[PDB]
Design a protein around this ligand. Structure first.
Ligand code: CDL
Ligand code: CDL
Ligand code: MQ9
Ligand code: 9YF
Ligand code: 9YF
Ligand code: HEC
Ligand code: HEC
Ligand code: 9XX
Ligand code: HUU
Ligand code: HUU
Ligand code: FES
Lengths: 163, 223, 267, 216, 216, 53, 54
């Protein structure tokens, strides 16, 4: 949250420690720091992107065996790092709340609980569709980069969905 | 220190061996392992008084500390020696640094809080409800060191913000924002908690509606 | 942040959920996706000019009808269906009405001073990522939010299409409004009272309608407190799942208990 | 109802492979370039580094030269703190781009870091005086480091990328070049003139270091 | 009414003086940095150039040396295209910073551009081998330009601003330093060792150029 | 440009020319100097709701 | 009138010839070209300066 300059910085797996969640955004190389005028508007677009925010959660190794995956998302996790959209699958509020030692992604707009261990599927509250899991990996220099786009649309559901 | 570790061991052997094995490995289904938790974890957990937990429930609540500052340090040093982990910040004198943990920047601290802390606590550091019997307690009581150590070690259902996610600078910034929000008077009259819509609506329906209806009953008649 | 996430939930999510034109209505209202750059100006136009104007016109109609459909009255000694017993406008009624306006303005000013309402400065500027735990709307939409919370995550998936659970609340509002706006006609269709009624009825004298209104108020209160189940759990130590399920069972049970109790109480 | 697609399928999965991104066609129409210069050759740009290795591979130094405004700008950083003895080292441009332990282009004794195909790496038509094959000397004090520059522009980036890769050879001597005048001094043969061995290129003891100039 | 000010035909006026703005005060104290480095002296920053002047006042080269990260970066751009003959000029660092046409510190023959108080500008405690004062050949081809650097860090920015200003001198010889081995080579007296004149500093013919190193 | 120069002439110059309170009226209307960052929203309020009402 | 970058440029007497007029603004060294976010607003302030133009 620096005032304007370099609001987004590349990230490394070591930074997230077991049982830790961090909100991450899709920062491109072209979308450099906000020093110039061309930048600071691309970065504003990233920040204001409704579906842009994601939460990266480091599953504790001891809990690793409990993880249940989603078909077509079996390799989305990079080791013990799981990227799930923050946008709730119900009405599109951010699902910011994260509970470790129970692995519950909680949405406070309507108190909806998704199981982080099992693919981020709603285990309580109004939500009925699992949070979209973002493929992740590490590129050259060991920085965490998305391994591809969401296999499904990520915001709240709508009429033209699940086809 | 040798005497510090001795005192920490003495206190540990008769307060928490039941929850955590004598070797600090957690007793099954009673308490977790304290190896690697660090002096910061011990300081935050015991200074807040949570650790003589006295029950296994959904959420261990904060309560008056069961040990004094010196004993807190003794326990934390004992745990640090056993496993080795995060250590509570300290100033030049050696005491738990609290004033020095107030970061200068607050707007950046505010952004950090809203992105990370407000998710569950509040806009202004108040509490928040969690999945099943859990909650995020209010940040008003926690001192700067306690807030810093809470970020540095995620107690239970708290994400653990390592020194790499939130560098000491960002942690001090967040501590500064927390303290400023907690101690800042609510401009515009009595701030009804920190939650807006709920206390505000309740206060409307009590104060304003009771007053208006009572004034109507005074002005009007009954029949 | 609070109002922004409220917009995101209500307007964006629910409008997008509507099956046929939901996405189209969302794109028309926001001129695009949710963070559309023409939302706040449009809401400003709707809120300072359009909706207050419509409300003022409807209030003019309301007061004109009450003025010319001379106010109804409660039964009493000299009170009948063909007269109005009270005080003429000028000497007494005007003075007390003006004094009541003065005292209501005084209550509102005292609240505006001594009570803090919507301390937006504590609420950072809206960002799609930042969040708060409370996240309620004003009390008059808390029933909407509670209906969202308590409705059990029921969705339907037609041929290549999704019908999100948010859709439900829209239908709910419809029914709610569709039942509120139309109620007198249902009352006259069921009871059969098609007579020109000028004498009011004490609520106790209409046990069925009093019970129905108590049931409706009970459901509204249950939904409103369900919206506050987050804060209720935080302050009053009750598990959030427990509060959610208390509301879920209540929105079916509490109305029935309240109807029975109110009926017997009126009798 | 439940959404159509969920569940693991009892498939474990594999660790994501290291990401290797491609150039940007959408953003960049072409391929961006770094340093710019005349580069009248196969292409070198305005950035070309080098690494000075010792007989056992120890980093003696790290040279780097590149064309900026028609006059090559160069500089050699020190690779070790005590790598250089407290004396003078003769830096020269060698025709051979291989920093082998001991290589001899001609038929004779192979000296350490003497793979150069002759003396100094002069121009193709230059074979007399000390042309671009001669570079600034490497004087080392007790500190043991290298930072100093000269003006040797008989060869450029266009001639740098020749048929045989060039290199930088660090000797262990000063810079005199038969400073003994013929009036007073004499050679082993009695002639007042200097030795052609020392005139072809800076000759000293065993080569101190050898670093490939081909963007090492 | 008319405004009070009105006309002034008298005092035709004076041409405005050239503006010389004052430095921005503590309020806008922020300004471009002049360079950072160890700077173990009275202060030189990370930028220090030099101009090489010939005997007739025509620039021959333009030397430069400045501390960057504790290791000096230097580059001597050519001042003229025909200034340098197709050969090697003996580079050296002179302790004396006065590039006069003819001046000799001791009592004797004053060679052109030989104002140095001795040989090479070594370190204060250095009086033997060719320390950073000594430099090797600067090569010019038929084009006649000098741009090439090496690694010679026997000194630093701290020693750059000595009591007597230093300078960069261009001789007319290469860098050999008695390349003739003592086993077979010999001097005028037959001694297998080298001459002290060529050992103390790079000795050559008439000085090619001399440029003060004090921000010339 | 046209309407902006019209504002500059009339609303700014005439308002700030008034003897007793000209500058005060100008600063109240524009919230500051002429190009004040509150002008157009205030004119919008005056033109869609207040004066039409 | 370049689109955003370096909107204000230094000026020299010979630029304006006899019988020529030029609109000029008070540009400072600090108010550099408009690339930076910090700049592009100092320059915008100069442009919007009601009394700035000369
Ligand atoms: C919150 C608590 C605040 C502390 C005050 C606690 C004292 C409460 C005393 C009321 C209890 C007695 C009762 O139940 O009946 C009272 C009254 C009449 O009862 P009744 O016998 O059945 O009717 C026949 C009377 O003869 C009817 O004849 P009448 O209409 O002519 O009687 C009016 C006389 C007697 O009737 C009354 O209205 C008595 C109320 C006086 C207390 C209010 C002033 C003190 C608090 C001000 C806030 C500071 O009125 C007055 O003298 C002026 C009172 C103006 C009404 C203001 C009430 C709203 C302000 C309080 C809410 C704001 C809270 C902010 C904190 O009914 C009410 O409920 C009055 C409103 C209740 C106010 C407290 C709200 C809780
Ligand atoms: C806006 C919100 C703010 C509040 C505004 C609403 C207030 C409503 C209260 C009603 C009071 C009322 O209408 O008063 C007018 C009322 C006219 O009614 P009236 O005279 O009894 O006529 C006999 C009945 O109209 C004969 O009719 P009827 O009773 O036999 O049954 C017919 C009745 C049937 O009842 C209805 O259907 C009435 C409902 C009408 C619906 C829509 C009306 C308003 C909607 C527009 C929204 C407004 C914005 O229709 C009406 O009478 C409607 C009259 C239209 C006026 C509506 C007022 C608004 O009283 C006056 O004439 C008093 C004014 C005296 C003249 C001024 C004195 C000095 C003159 C100097 C002037 C300038 C001096 C310069 C020097
Ligand atoms: C969907 C749904 C309603 C789920 C259930 C959640 C719920 C409302 C549970 C009940 C909450 C209670 C009453 C907890 C107390 C423990 C308990 C349940 C005891 C047994 C209940 C019982 C029948 C007892 C017999 C006697 C009896 C009726 C006792 C009731 C006790 C109470 C609390 C009476 C007052 C009712 C009341 C004001 C409730 C809180 C309502 C709200 C939304 C307050 C909002 C509010 C808050 C949250 C502030 O923090 C605040 C801070 C500063 C200024 C103002 C406020 C403010 O107005
Ligand atoms: C016509 C309207 C009349 C309204 C009266 C106006 C009263 C003016 C009060 C004085 C000026 C404004 C005070 C602003 C400063 C201020 O806000 O006041 C707090 C207090 O707040 C509290 O605790 C509550 C204390 C209890 C007394 C006040 C209760 C008044 C209620 C009853 C009136 C509204 C009606 C509600 C009825 C609801 C009932 C439903 C049946 C005091 O500090 P503190 O106590 O420490 O707050 C903690 C931070 O420190 C800490 O960090 C923080 O994290 C928190 O822990 C915070 O509590
Ligand atoms: C105006 C509002 C009036 C209320 C209206 C509604 C009345 C209908 C009440 C319906 C009661 C339904 C209770 C069931 C709820 C339920 O199903 O949830 C349970 C939790 O049961 C409970 O608490 C029992 C709670 C029963 C209390 C209801 C009392 C009535 C109160 C609210 C009346 C006062 C009203 C005052 C109003 C004030 C005036 C208003 C103007 C378990 O949750 P959980 O917590 O996640 O436990 C996990 C396991 O699941 C898991 O296996 C295990 O492994 C564990 O992990 C465990 O965590
Ligand atoms: C009863 C069971 C106890 C006893 C008497 C103590 N602890 Fe421990 N502890 C217990 C639980 C159920 C948990 C996890 C949830 C919670 O903390 O409420 C813990 C955890 C800790 C931690 C946190 C480790 C971390 O965050 O990485 C620490 C530092 C810790 N416990 C230490 C500790 C000390 C010093 C005690 C004596 C003062 C102690 N505990 C007692 C359960 C129980
Ligand atoms: C819901 C996920 C979650 C998020 C994310 C989170 N918290 Fe917490 N917080 C909790 C929970 C749960 C506790 C209870 C700790 C315990 O019971 O030991 C807590 C406790 C605390 C405490 C202890 C206060 C006390 O009195 O005991 C502080 C301080 C705190 N959090 C601050 C923060 C800060 C600062 C951040 C942002 C870095 C943050 N929180 C982010 C959930 C969260
Ligand atoms: C908001 C308005 C809600 C209107 C829903 C219109 C549904 C049309 C599409 C249904 C469908 O075919 O999707 C597949 C489904 C998910 O799976 C099943 O086929 C098994 C369904 C078992 C339970 C059915 C209960 C239906 C009750 C509703 C008809 C009552 C609505 C009032
Ligand atoms: C969602 C709950 C909620 N959660 C939070 C969390 C935090 C905060 Cl701060 C606030 N909240 C709120 C919240 O405040 N909700 C108020 C609300 C809800 C819905 C609508 N709706 C208008 C009609 C649309 C509609 C319906 C039918 C249509 O068809 C027609 F009519 F025929 F054209 C067209 C449009 C749906 C949205 C408005 C306000
Ligand atoms: C100026 C001419 C002009 N040149 C151009 C060029 C280009 C273009 Cl596009 C348009 N134009 C126009 C232009 O359009 N002129 C319209 C105009 C004129 C005057 C006022 N004035 C009203 C009173 C205020 C006032 C004064 C006294 C008061 O005292 C009281 F009443 F007692 F409170 C209150 C208000 C001052 C401004 C408005 C519009
Ligand atoms: S907004 Fe997330 S559960 Fe409804």
């Amino acid at each position: 949250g620096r005032p304007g300059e370099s609001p987004f910085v590349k990230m490394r797996p070591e930074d997230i420690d077991a049982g830790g969640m961090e909100t991450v955004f899709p920062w491109r190389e072209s979308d450099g720091d906000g020093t110039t005028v061309e930048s600071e508007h691309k970065l504003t677009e990233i920040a204001m992107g409704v579906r842009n925010p994601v939460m990266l959660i480091r599953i504790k190794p001891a809990d690793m065996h409990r993880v249940i995956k989603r078909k077509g998302q079996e390799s989305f996790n990079f080791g013990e790092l799981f990227a799930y959209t923050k946008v709730c699958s119900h009405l599109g509020c951010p699902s910011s709340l994260y509970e470790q030692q129970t692995y519950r992604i909680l949405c406070p707009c309507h108190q909806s609980q998704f199981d982080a261990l099992e693919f981020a599927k709603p285990i309580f509250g109004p939500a009925a569709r699992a949070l979209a899991q973002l493929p992740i990996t590490i590129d050259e220099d060991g920085y965490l980069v998305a391994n591809g786009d969401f296999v499904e649309p990520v915001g709240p559901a709508f009429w033209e969905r699940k086809s | 220190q040798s005497a510090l570790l001795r005192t920490g061991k003495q206190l540990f052997e008769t307060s928490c061996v039941s929850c955590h094995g004598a070797n600090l490995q957690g007793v099954p289904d009673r308490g977790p392992s304290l190896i690697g938790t660090g002096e910061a974890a011990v300081y935050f957990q015991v200074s807040t008084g949570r650790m003589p937990a006295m029950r296994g429930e959904a959420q261990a609540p904060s309560k008056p500390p069961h040990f004094d500052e010196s004993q807190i340090d003794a326990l934390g040093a004992y745990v640090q020696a056993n496993g080795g982990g995060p250590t509570v910040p300290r100033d030049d004198h050696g005491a738990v640094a609290q004033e020095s943990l107030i970061g200068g920047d607050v707007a950046r601290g505010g952004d950090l809080f809203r992105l990370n802390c407000a998710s569950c606590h509040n806009f202004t550091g108040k509490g928040g409800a969690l999945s099943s019997g859990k909650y995020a307690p209010d940040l008003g009581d926690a001192n700067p060191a306690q807030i810093y150590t809470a970020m540095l070690t995620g107690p239970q259902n708290m994400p653990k913000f390592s020194d790499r996610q939130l560098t000491p600078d960002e942690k001090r910034d967040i501590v500064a924002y927390v303290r400023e929000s907690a101690e800042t008077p609510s401009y515009g009259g009595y701030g009804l908690g920190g939650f807006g819509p709920a206390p505000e609506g309740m206060a409307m329906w009590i104060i304003g509606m009771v007053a208006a209806i009572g004034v109507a009953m005074w002005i009007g008649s009954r029949a | 942040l609070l109002s922004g996430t409220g917009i995101r939930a209500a307007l964006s999510g629910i409008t997008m959920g509507i099956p046929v034109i939901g996405t189209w209505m969302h794109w028309a209202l926001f001129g695009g996706d949710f963070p559309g750059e023409i939302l706040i100006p449009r809401l400003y136009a709707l809120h300072i000019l359009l909706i207050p104007g419509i409300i003022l016109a409807l209030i003019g109609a309301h007061l004109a009808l009450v003025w010319f459909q001379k106010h109804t009255q409660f039964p009493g000694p000299g009170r009948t269906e063909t007269n109005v017993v009270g005080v003429r406008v000028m000497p007494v009624f005007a003075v007390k009405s003006g004094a009541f306006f003065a005292m209501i303005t005084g209550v509102l000013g005292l609240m505006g001073g001594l009570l803090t309402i919507n301390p937006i400065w504590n609420l950072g500027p809206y960002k799609p990522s930042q969040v708060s735990a409370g996240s309620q709307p004003d009390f008059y939409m808390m029933w909407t939010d509670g209906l969202i919370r308590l409705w059990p995550a029921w969705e339907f998936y037609p041929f290549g299409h999704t019908i999100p659970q948010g859709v439900w609340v829209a239908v709910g509002m419809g029914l709610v409004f569709a039942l509120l706006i139309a109620y007198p006609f249902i009352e006259k269709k069921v009871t059969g009272d098609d007579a020109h009624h000028n004498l009011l009825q004490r609520p106790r004298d209409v046990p069925v309608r009093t019970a129905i209104g108590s049931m409706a108020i009970a459901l509204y209160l249950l939904l409103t407190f369900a919206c506050m189940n987050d804060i209720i759990a935080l302050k009053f130590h009750i598990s959030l799942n427990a509060t959610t399920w208390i509301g879920r069972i209540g929105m079916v049970v509490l109305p029935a208990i309240v109807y029975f109790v109110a009926y017997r109480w009126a009798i | 109802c439940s959404p159509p697609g969920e569940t693991a399928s009892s498939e474990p999965g594999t660790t994501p492979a290291i990401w290797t991104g491609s150039p940007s066609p959408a953003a960049p129409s072409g391929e961006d370039h770094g340093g710019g210069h005349g580069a009248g050759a196969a292409g070198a740009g305005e950035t070309l580094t080098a690494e000075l290795k010792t007989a056992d591979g120890t980093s003696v130094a790290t040279a780097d030269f590149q064309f900026a405004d028609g006059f090559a700008t160069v500089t050699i950083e020190t690779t070790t703190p005590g790598r250089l003895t407290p004396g003078f080292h003769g830096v020269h441009i060698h025709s051979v781009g291989k920093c082998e332990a001991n290589s001899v282009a001609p038929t004779g004794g192979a000296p350490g870091d003497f793979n150069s195909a002759g003396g100094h790496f002069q121009v193709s038509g230059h074979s007399g005086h000390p042309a671009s094959g001669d570079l600034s000397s490497l004087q080392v004090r007790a500190d043991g480091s290298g930072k100093l520059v000269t003006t040797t522009d008989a060869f450029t980036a266009e001639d740098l990328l020749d048929g045989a890769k060039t290199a930088i050879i660090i000797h262990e001597k000063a810079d005199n070049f038969a400073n003994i005048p013929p009036e007073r001094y004499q050679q082993v043969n009695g002639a007042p003139g200097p030795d052609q061995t020392t005139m072809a290129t800076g000759d000293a003891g065993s080569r101190v270091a050898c670093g490939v100039i081909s963007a090492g």
